[PDB]
């Protein structure tokens, strides 16, 4: 019944008392005596120790030890000793402190990933970045879906590609690059662009679809409709020029769908021409932000140790000001697509 | 003087009127008449046109046309035709959208040197963005070898590279991706303040090494005395961090805005510290760091982290900024 202090815990003399933990879980304890007691308590768990064995080395009364212990435990600053039964040499071990800090057993999160199947629909900028994260974190099977070939302008965002790869299919090159980074996983490729809605039937069932393909305009409306009918989870990720966007992560029966919170002849011609000329002002930093947070949601969605951010939300992060905003995309019982 | 509609402009019917633009410049025009006048005006510039010529082409009054024109021009939805002139094409739309001449930005990048001080997760991701964006010279600084454990977030590295020097492999991989640039390596870790003298002068230093714990304090102090711009990026477990972007004479520095037995215990615990690394958090810090570098050198938009340390949460929907403005009383500067 051993507990151990997580390596990811830092403490700081700060203000009147101090801080315990780093990151989202950082807690400021205003009272210097209580904070000193949390330090004396945490110290007793540097080595894997039961509550009582640790208590035996504490020089503080039991009521205080007990309150500090409960504090450390609830925040996952101390964790079950067995949750630390990896090898420091396991390829995925870096991530393991990440899982521990969420109160999960890394071995178990890692087993969920190894057994998962992820369809990457769109192998451009976002697909490149999502698929390597997923590959290097240990998702067991990655199915890459794209019919496009590599051009020279791809190279600003499309991280897995080199000058030498120009002319080749995006799916072949991504596959070569993922297996070079993680040869323990399985990678397959389907030579397809979603031209009609009907094409979506050619895309395999999986734990989740990562949806970022480039054409048509209404690809999400298609994918949404299809996935609702097929009970297929999906995450959309993308950008609107300088804003990085990820979400919603659609979960059948559990979340809203894309279409849930959807609210002159000559003028209409002009709009249609203006919009047909549209090309996004792509920029790797924006691409990379959207892809990273998309991958984070995919890992949490399959690993199950923290709630994905984009459940029932489309999330925007601005690049030219400090601004994140979410769009409500929760379930409407009146929805045309997933409703009544 | 020709003007042209930028390709990154998007229009949609919405509410009482509609949306003009995409991204941070997106604007909700409530008045439908005005919204339609904006589109009729934008339409005259799909192919490049002078003002006077588009005016004759548009079926709207001189008064409205002037107004809609200025609306489009001031938002960089229409740009000088010369800005419309390739490897860096999508970056070009990005600069145009900020009212810059892309070729002039691209020339500033081409002419810049960036030090990458630390070639782990952040350095990997920052250096590849910089290289493919056309930053002219990149100096890679690290004395570490690649381990199988790196691969989770050090994106340029492969299982076949395990055992080689990070600088050497980064250089190869940056050069595979943009053969037009120059890349340098320095086989050096900063284990003492004195080691910072081996790091050359650059437009900016991108600082991101996990250890020593106080590396950023040494860098800060060295850079203030050397008048060396630098930007810090990294993470505090699940929180992505970038900033400050230190600019000599212009911003505050990293130091501006900030019992026997216990200090012993505190020191022991803290010395066992290992960060809870997670590639998504790493990649976010690195991407927004690289955006600030490109903006800092390209001078087309204000970097976000001027005077600011910025955190993006990964387990909450949250960005928070800490003010790092100049302090008269700062122990390092002022």
């Amino acid at each position: 019944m051993d507990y151990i202090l997580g390596r990811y815990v830092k403490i700081a003399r700060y203000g009147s008392g101090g801080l315990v933990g780093g990151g989202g879980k950082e807690q400021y304890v205003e009272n210097l005596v209580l904070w000193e007691n949390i330090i004396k308590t945490a110290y007793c768990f540097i080595t894997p120790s039961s509550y009582t064995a640790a208590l035996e080395t504490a020089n503080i009364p039991e009521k205080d030890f007990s309150n500090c212990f409960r504090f450390l435990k609830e925040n996952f600053f101390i964790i079950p000793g067995e949750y630390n039964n990896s090898t420091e040499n396991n390829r995925y071990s870096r991530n393991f402190l990440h899982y521990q800090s969420y109160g999960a057993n890394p071995v178990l999160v890692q087993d969920k990933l190894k057994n998962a199947k992820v369809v990457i629909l769109g192998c451009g900028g976002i697909g490149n970045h999502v698929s390597v994260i997923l590959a290097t974190s240990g998702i067991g099977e990655i199915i890459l879906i794209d019919n496009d070939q590599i051009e020279n302008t791809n190279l600003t965002r499309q991280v897995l590609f080199s000058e030498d790869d120009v002319g080749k299919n995006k799916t072949e090159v991504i596959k070569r690059e993922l297996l070079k980074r993680n040869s323990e996983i399985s990678v397959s490729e389907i030579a397809l662009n979603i031209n009609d809605y009907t094409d979506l039937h050619k895309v395999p069932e999986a734990d989740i679809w990562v949806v970022s393909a480039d054409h048509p305009f209404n690809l999400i409306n298609w994918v949404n409709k299809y996935c609702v009918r097929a009970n297929q989870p999906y995450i959309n990720a993308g950008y609107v020029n300088d804003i990085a966007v990820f979400g919603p992560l659609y979960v059948p029966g559990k979340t809203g769908c894309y279409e849930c919170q959807k609210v002159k002849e000559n003028i209409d011609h002009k709009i249609k021409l203006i919009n047909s000329r549209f090309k996004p002002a792509t920029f790797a930093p924006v691409n990379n932000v959207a892809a990273a947070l998309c991958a984070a949601d995919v890992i949490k969605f399959i690993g199950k140790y923290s709630e994905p951010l984009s459940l029932n939300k489309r999330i925007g992060i601005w690049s030219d000001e400090i601004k994140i905003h979410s769009q409500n995309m929760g379930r409407s019982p009146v929805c045309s697509v997933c409703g009544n | 003087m020709d003007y042209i509609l930028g390709r990154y402009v998007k229009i949609a019917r919405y509410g009482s009127g509609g949306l003009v633009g995409g991204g941070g410049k997106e604007q909700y025009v409530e008045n439908l008449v005005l919204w339609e006048n904006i589109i009729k005006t934008a339409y005259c510039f799909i192919t490049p046109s002078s003002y006077t010529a588009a005016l004759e082409t548009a079926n709207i009054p001189e008064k409205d046309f002037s107004n809609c024109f200025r609306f489009l021009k001031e938002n960089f939805f229409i740009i000088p035709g010369e800005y419309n002139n390739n490897r860096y094409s999508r970056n070009f739309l990005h600069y145009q959208s900020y009212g810059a001449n892309p070729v002039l930005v691209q020339d500033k990048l081409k002419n810049a040197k960036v030090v990458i001080l630390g070639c782990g997760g952040i350095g990997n991701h920052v250096s590849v963005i910089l290289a493919t964006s056309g930053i002219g010279e990149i100096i890679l600084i690290d004395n570490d070898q690649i381990e199988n454990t790196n691969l989770t977030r050090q994106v340029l590295f492969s299982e076949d590279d395990v055992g080689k020097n990070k600088t050497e492999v980064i250089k190869r991989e940056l050069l595979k991706r943009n053969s037009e640039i120059s890349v340098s390596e320095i086989a050096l870790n900063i284990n003492d303040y004195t080691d910072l003298h081996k790091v050359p002068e650059a437009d900016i230093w991108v600082v991101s090494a996990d250890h020593p714990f106080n590396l950023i304090n040494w860098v800060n102090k060295y850079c203030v005395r050397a008048n060396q711009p630098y930007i810090n990026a990294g993470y505090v477990n699940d929180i992505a961090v970038f900033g400050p972007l230190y600019v000599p004479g212009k911003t505050g520095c990293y130091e501006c805005q900030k019992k026997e037995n216990i200090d012993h215990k505190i020191k022991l615990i803290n010395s066992r510290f290992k960060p809870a690394t997670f590639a998504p958090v790493n990649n976010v810090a690195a991407a927004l760091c690289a955006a600030d570098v490109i903006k800092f050198i390209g001078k087309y938009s204000e970097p976000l982290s001027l005077n600011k340390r910025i955190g993006i949460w990964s387990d909450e929907i949250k960005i928070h900024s800490q003010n790092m403005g100049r302090s008269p009383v700062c122990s390092v500067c002022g």
Partner: peptide
């Protein structure tokens, strides 16, 4: 945030 960066 309130604590220094890991790297």
């Amino acid at each position: 945030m309130r604590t220094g960066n890991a790297n």
